[PDB]
């Protein structure tokens, strides 16, 4: 659990975490590496309050309609979960999702997916922005 003063400049504080809404243009894998380069991780969303905070930020701009987050398919797990290996707690899939494409997750804004999770097949070559998280956990 971070305090506000743990957050680097240009990072937003919410609920014991610091967040970077980065507008660089990376594939999902590139975004995972980027967040690691900042001693962070792609965001993991453990509760509805955190999901709401993220939606508040994403709905506050209109240039972007998807952001990479820290979940993908893992064949040994044989499921979708967070990249730390933790299973989902809060379930944030948009209506009709997932497609089960063994892909990578974003927050998406399109039709009935109103800044909710989607799975995308291409984890390398679909370039977009991402959300990094520092949570000062163990």
């Amino acid at each position: 659990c971070c305090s506000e003063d743990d957050c680097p400049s240009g990072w937003k504080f919410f609920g014991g975490s610091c967040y970077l809404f980065d507008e660089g243009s990376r594939g999902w894998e590139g975004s995972k590496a980027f967040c690691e380069s900042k001693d962070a991780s792609l965001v993991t969303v453990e509760c509805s309050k955190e999901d709401d905070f993220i939606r508040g930020i994403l709905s506050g701009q209109t240039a972007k309609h998807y952001y990479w987050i820290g979940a993908r398919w893992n064949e040994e797990h044989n499921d979708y979960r967070w990249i730390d290996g933790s299973p989902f707690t809060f379930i944030g899939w948009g209506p009709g999702k997932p497609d089960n494409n063994k892909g990578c997750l974003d927050y998406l804004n399109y039709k009935e997916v109103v800044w909710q999770w989607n799975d995308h097949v291409d984890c390398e070559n679909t370039n977009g922005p991402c959300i990094c998280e520092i949570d000062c956990s163990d």
Partner: protein, 137 residues
């Protein structure tokens, strides 16, 4: 529960907040107490959760058992979690449960190494307990 949502003295794991309460109460009074905390005695659905709990209680040595949220369900004629659900994960200690009509603890004694044991006095045997909340509504 959010990761940083827990009350002072509670710990987060796996979407829940836990209280390892050291006040010694009978099992029924422990159940009541967890209810009073907007919680319930812990139910252990997964080996992951079992490991977490063991991690906390094995790191102290004042107490050798903690009450948990399982007990004999007379209609089903077996042990069930106090939300009524079946005990899908086998965390019992060897040759446990020994007897029907009991309430459950984690116990550390002889062959039972921080595993579940059945105790047949759910009222007047006073021990610490573990409360779990998922912070719902």
């Amino acid at each position: 529960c959010c990761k940083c949502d827990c009350q002072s003295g509670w710990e987060w794991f796996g979407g829940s907040c836990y209280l390892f309460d050291e006040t010694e109460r009978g099992w029924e009074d422990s159940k009541t107490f967890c209810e009073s905390q907007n919680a319930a005695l812990v139910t252990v659905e997964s080996s992951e959760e079992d490991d977490f709990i063991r991690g906390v209680i094995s790191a102290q040595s004042a107490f050798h058992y903690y009450w948990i949220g399982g007990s004999w369900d007379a209609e089903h004629s077996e042990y069930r979690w106090i939300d009524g659900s079946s005990i899908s994960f086998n965390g019992w200690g060897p040759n446990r449960p020994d007897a029907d009509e009991g309430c459950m603890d984690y116990l550390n004694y002889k062959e039972i190494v921080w595993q579940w044991n059945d105790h047949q006095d759910c009222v007047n045997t006073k021990g610490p307990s573990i409360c779990e909340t998922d912070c719902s509504e």
